[PDB]
Amino acid sequence: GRTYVYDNKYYKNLDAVIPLDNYLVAEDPFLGPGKNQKLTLFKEIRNVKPDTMKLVVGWKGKEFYRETWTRFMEDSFPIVNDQEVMDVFLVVNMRPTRPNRCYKFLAQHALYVPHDVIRIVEPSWVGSNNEYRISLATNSFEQFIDRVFYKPIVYIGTDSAEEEEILLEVSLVFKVKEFAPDAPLFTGPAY
């Protein structure tokens, strides 16, 4: 948009001259409000037979809570501001250990000792990001137990007609709402 004046005659550039409302969709939590904090717990290789699923993790509650508290605190310390853990996601990331394989990943979870191997029965189909993301929603682990999110068990399979070797990566993704005051950090003594 450009203007020119020639003896009270004005010029402009030619180029410049030339239902669903009732519904809502949820925002992706990792893309939505709050910070993302990924704590990778472990790696695992499983070989899965067709029409079966293998147990990914079989921790007792005390071990799940010890691993969660330890890893979160070791990574986060010092917690400098008031913050809220909006949610904790158990993330299972899958990949083939072999190239030139074409199949889809299958998963199911639950929130006694679980079966190591189960048959596929109406599973959840894992998308192309090959990740199954499960919503699970102190000074010492002792105080964490004294002051009293679900303990997950997960099964992974494929829709393949042959045995498949899978590499699994299990993580905890924390959704954190940080309340950092409009206050600077000063070297002591302040002022």
Place this chain on the structure above:
Amino acid sequence: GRTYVYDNKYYKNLDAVIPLDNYLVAEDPFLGPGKNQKLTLFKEIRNVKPDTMKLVVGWKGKEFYRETWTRFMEDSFPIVNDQEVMDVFLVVNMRPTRPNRCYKFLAQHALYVPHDVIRIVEPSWVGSNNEYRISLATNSFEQFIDRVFYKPIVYIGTDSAEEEEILLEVSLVFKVKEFAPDAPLFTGPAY
């Protein structure tokens, strides 16, 4: 895609030669993971006056729990594997008893003795499948009570300007996550 070789000259068939990412949508529960188990409880005929809704079911808690436990166990026994009831849906299926009628179904629920007849006030509009699906989330019924999902009441109406006779079918649809081990059934003694 076809290939031909004629004296080091290669040939191929002519025919062969010639934003929203931030958001999520929930999967339909009946189409999603887990098995579907429909227990039809009863059939009912109601005549509904314009601008009114009639009570479909007025069971006491003890009767709702007796009917649910009895029908589920009678249908399922023996429960052979570890399983989880993900959810229980109260399904109300509606149909006109007369042909050549054009109107939409209206519904409302709640989770003292309820009114048999109420006035329509900002109802839920039932879709073209003519079904209103409400999420409600042992050895004897006694043990089921001893070990301690909501008790629903439902109203059905029409947007019709005349009285309408409706046939109602009330069911419980269970969402079941079955954990069947990779283990066969053998005639005893095994091996």
Place this chain on the structure above:
Amino acid sequence: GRTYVYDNKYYKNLDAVIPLDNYLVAEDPFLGPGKNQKLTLFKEIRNVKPDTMKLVVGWKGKEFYRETWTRFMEDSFPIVNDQEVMDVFLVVNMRPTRPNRCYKFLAQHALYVPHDVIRIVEPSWVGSNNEYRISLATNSFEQFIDRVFYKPIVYIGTDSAEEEEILLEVSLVFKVKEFAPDAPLFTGPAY
């Protein structure tokens, strides 16, 4: 569609002669079933610095519950029919106090004394309706406390590179399911 008969020959007007199914979307609560009841609590002017958010409301629980019970009962009395409060939304409506300003509103909530001023960290982006709507789900306030929804705190900011004066309006929007019987109101004595 018009028909004419001329000596057993029939005539008609020329003009008359000439995947996504697996998923669900939630209905907007204010547009969906149940009545809407808006109780405006107060108005507030805040001046917000770039990259910061100011506290909108810092009521103690007892004050939040006193304000909610008082305003709801004063507005609703007499409650003539059986009704259910489906949900309570804390609505924060924002507007600039100045014209010719172009920026987007930013918000974050939480359900000790909160900080008056915080830094913007992965906030929720407020849409073009300039409203942040938070789901929060007796005879005297004493009976309301004796018989025992969350207490919200909200921060508002802008993505502006300059200081901005904002006018805020805080309301409670109640979602009400009214069960009005098919019964008239008669002057006493009835019949």
Place this chain on the structure above:
Amino acid sequence: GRTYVYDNKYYKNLDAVIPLDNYLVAEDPFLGPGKNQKLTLFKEIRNVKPDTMKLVVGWKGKEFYRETWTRFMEDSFPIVNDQEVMDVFLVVNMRPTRPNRCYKFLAQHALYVPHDVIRIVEPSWVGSNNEYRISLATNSFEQFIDRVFYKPIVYIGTDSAEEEEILLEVSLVFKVKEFAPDAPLFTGPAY
């Protein structure tokens, strides 16, 4: 169109969420009101020279009326209900006696002894159904004559540059308006 309720939140399926008036055209009589009754009178083979048409039928009035009354009554008896003959169509169906011939059929009618062979002069062009349909609108044939539709003569040709052998089928198609009472047939004596 499917609806789901989860704790007072409503869901719907995504797929369900996503001049010439001044004029009239006549309805095809065979497709329009009234029954169709086809009485095939005869078959005929004619060889037609280019630019000429041959006489299909040269019956005297008395023979046309004898053939019509006889064939209609022999086919229809007993006429059980009140009925009206809306119209009578003389239908001439044409086909080549040879395969691999490509030409169009030509026709002309009239309602002294007619010429057997005439020259083509501004004829009617027969369509791809190869049928020329001409609208022509008692106890004994004697009573039919005593109580007193036109007698047709028809010529058929081709636009071919060679002699063509044609197979002709001549029929009478009656348009019948039946007035069958809402009354059953009982074995005598009735009741």
Place this chain on the structure above:
Amino acid sequence: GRTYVYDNKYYKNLDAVIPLDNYLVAEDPFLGPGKNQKLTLFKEIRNVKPDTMKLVVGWKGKEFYRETWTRFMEDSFPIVNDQEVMDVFLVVNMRPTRPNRCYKFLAQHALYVPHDVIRIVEPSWVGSNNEYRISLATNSFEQFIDRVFYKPIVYIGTDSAEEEEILLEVSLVFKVKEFAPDAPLFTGPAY
């Protein structure tokens, strides 16, 4: 479509390799079967006032029949073959006597002495061909009267807001079905 053979390999040119059914429409009579014979009777100039129509022709029956028989026979004699007059159309062709005029022609007919001037009342609108075509369906005129089509009267107007001078041409268009035998004309004596 071209084909080439090179040592049992076949080649083809690349370019060669790459509801309303229930209704009928009448064919335009002048374009349809039968010959057209135009007998122009006379020319006439009329000046028509806005919202009025002037009488085009006011002949007595005897004059209409004398003019028709005389003009048809004078033009046609000798009638060499058997023929049928399918129909007679009274054609009124209109044109402005002045250039640079923009208006539409209006017409009405009827099949006592008629009024010379009438008011326009729900007329027929003449199309862009500026022609109003009305279907009207011996040795001496005496024999034509002795052996015993309607006598038309026509009014023409305009939708103009001023007086308009119109040139009218009145004709009779005959639709003739000629039955010319497949027989030559020989100089006498034949053979």
Place this chain on the structure above:
Amino acid sequence: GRTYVYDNKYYKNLDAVIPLDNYLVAEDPFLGPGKNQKLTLFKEIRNVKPDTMKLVVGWKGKEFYRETWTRFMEDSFPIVNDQEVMDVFLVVNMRPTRPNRCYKFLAQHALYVPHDVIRIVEPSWVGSNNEYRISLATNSFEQFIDRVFYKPIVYIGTDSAEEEEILLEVSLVFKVKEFAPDAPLFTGPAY
């Protein structure tokens, strides 16, 4: 654009989720900067023969300047602010005196006694607004002459094949750039 929060899960409305540069064009002066002031000078009826143009105005310079100064000053007095006459347009507005006429207007101007009637020779074609707009760029008329825009002559014709009566309206349209200070009008004495 609407936002909802349900237990740290964020929601948005579905509808909201879903060369020539080198050249310039002049702005229409009547639509462009500066005020418009129309002084209608006179009305005139002319009858124009085909292929000819008639003189609209034949004023001497002194009369053109007297008429312009008088009409402008009589209309404008008092000139309260500093202003600049950017341009003066001689506007000739044309219309037929008769309805139902279809032709285009033709014009030519010039800035001895002119011919009253000229032949059409490569004229300017007047557009559908039927206006020909010609750019022409004190206390007493005497001072206006003492202190010392062109004097126009205009011809109007038609492309019609007949004589046409035209109604002409001749005006002067002034383009005025007003410099009104940011100062109020006070009743004397001020303050």
Place this chain on the structure above:
Amino acid sequence: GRTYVYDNKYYKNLDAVIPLDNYLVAEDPFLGPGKNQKLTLFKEIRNVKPDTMKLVVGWKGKEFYRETWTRFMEDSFPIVNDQEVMDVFLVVNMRPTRPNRCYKFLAQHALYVPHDVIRIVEPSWVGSNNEYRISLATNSFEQFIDRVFYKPIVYIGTDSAEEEEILLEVSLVFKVKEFAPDAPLFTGPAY
């Protein structure tokens, strides 16, 4: 296309009323002129390492000619009519022995003892039909040698990053031009 006549008025159905030339392409031989005769010679399983190709067939000329003559004659005898072998294609059909594998087949041929294993160097890419088709153009095998098409060697590989087990089927496809006289087969003696 249907026609109707009503009192000399004709009716028709409404529905019926409403560069690269310089070049040639070769016809697919199996789809083109001449009969197809497939003689399957053998089946073979090969395991191919990434970036390598394995020899499919390493027959001496005498063995290739013995296998070809024997299989063709055993299948064809008696050759009842004059015929011409237009061409002989060596067809190598490939398939994975495992499901859920995604890769493309690679091939190369040649028309001393060949290497069993070679490296992939600018190969021919096999299309989606997984077939590599190579054009190769008596009473006893002795007479076939006495009266004196090329002897092929073929390599097959994949573009896979892992070792792949392939099932190969090697065939000879004959293109046969049969000249069967217009003469019947009679039981002897004829006539």
Place this chain on the structure above:
Amino acid sequence: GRTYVYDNKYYKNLDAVIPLDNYLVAEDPFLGPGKNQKLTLFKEIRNVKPDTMKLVVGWKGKEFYRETWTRFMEDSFPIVNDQEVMDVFLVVNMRPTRPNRCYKFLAQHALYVPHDVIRIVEPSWVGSNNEYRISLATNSFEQFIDRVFYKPIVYIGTDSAEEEEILLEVSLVFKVKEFAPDAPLFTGPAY
């Protein structure tokens, strides 16, 4: 594209201001490089029965070579420049002897006495140009034999269900590459 200059301001006309790469196709030989020379050898009428083909030409080699040498030399003499016969095509042009016939032509060739009549077995389908073009690639005929292109036999049929009379025209089309020097023709003696 037009340019105008008005006092250092430049003007231009408004109208002026406003995969398959890996493959080759052969050029049609008659449209491609080299001259075309058509020598028509003979005309022939054949009547072909359905599902049969008739022999077009049954010349002995000596006759084919005599006819070819004689016709080529008689037509070409004197051969004034160095030239190369790129190819010789046997062209068979077909046409029906009767009008109003719709069928496709069928052909087959071969390069003992051949059968006059054969059955159609997987023929070549002749395109809409009705031509079958077969590539066949001295001072006296004696020298042509002394110094030592194939001898063709051709069959023609139709896909017709009746007997068809065909007119055949057999030609030889020569593809000639002429090397005419950049040298004039002078009357002797030159210079």
Place this chain on the structure above:
Amino acid sequence: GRTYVYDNKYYKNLDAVIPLDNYLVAEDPFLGPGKNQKLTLFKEIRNVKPDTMKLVVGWKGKEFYRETWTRFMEDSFPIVNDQEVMDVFLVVNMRPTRPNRCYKFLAQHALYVPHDVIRIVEPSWVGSNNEYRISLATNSFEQFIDRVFYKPIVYIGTDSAEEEEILLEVSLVFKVKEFAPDAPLFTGPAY
């Protein structure tokens, strides 16, 4: 476009085988013929009230000419070739001093002491480049005055409903037509 020859057969790549005229538009002067020379004169900050415009520059003629001559000569010296100043543009470039402001710029010019502040009356609307470009068309400044383009005054405003602080940059853009001979620069003495 690629060509291949195989034994007199030619190949080509497949990919290669597959009103307003009456008017003119002016070319943008800065993009059109002649060089551009920008002499920035000064920077200025103005605060403009809604519905008002502030004076940008109020130089006397002698100061405008002194500033123009001085700046042009200081920048250009030495003028080595014959050149023509086609035009001089007064360019006023505007920008807000604050971010997050949305309004359009308004301007007016004129070519006594002018008012510092005027009311907006039919202004020129400044385009998105935020520039108002006004066409204005020796050895010492004394000689420049002795040998004898307009002196501009400019007002700038906004369409804003609040007071706005604007940063203005005033420049002179010269359009220069340089006539540099086809002659080199040599160090003296030449040759």
Place this chain on the structure above:
Amino acid sequence: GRTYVYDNKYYKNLDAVIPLDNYLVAEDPFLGPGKNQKLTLFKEIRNVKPDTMKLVVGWKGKEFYRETWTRFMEDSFPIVNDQEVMDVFLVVNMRPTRPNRCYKFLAQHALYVPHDVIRIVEPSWVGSNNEYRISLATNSFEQFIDRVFYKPIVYIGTDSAEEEEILLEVSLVFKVKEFAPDAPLFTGPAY
């Protein structure tokens, strides 16, 4: 494709939720199977008159074979693996020696002393790559002659109406099928 689980409710990202077969085309040899080896023989400048072609190369057979053997062996030695020369292309690359010339290249070849200059007669048109590619399909040159591809002559012209100077580059492009065993190169002695 991303999946989320919230209390047995499954979520997916919205974005993820939303004839010629009978013919073959030859693959470009330089893009198809086998390696490419370009041996540039020489450069040449020719001036070609309109409607004429100049001889590019006039080598005797012995010189063509000496140049080919020498250049191929000098470039290739040592030939380390078994290889097959699939084809040899004579490539003539053309370019103008002058800029701002617009014409197309013309070519013709042949496989006595040839004329240096010939007239253009039905040539091959060279495409936009300006290359004419002609398919032409030991220890010492003596052994190459002792053990016994065509010798080409090429003419180049233009469709220009003036004389044109052309730069020509003549090369031999070899198509090589390398059979490199799956065997490494070891320093002697191996193992």
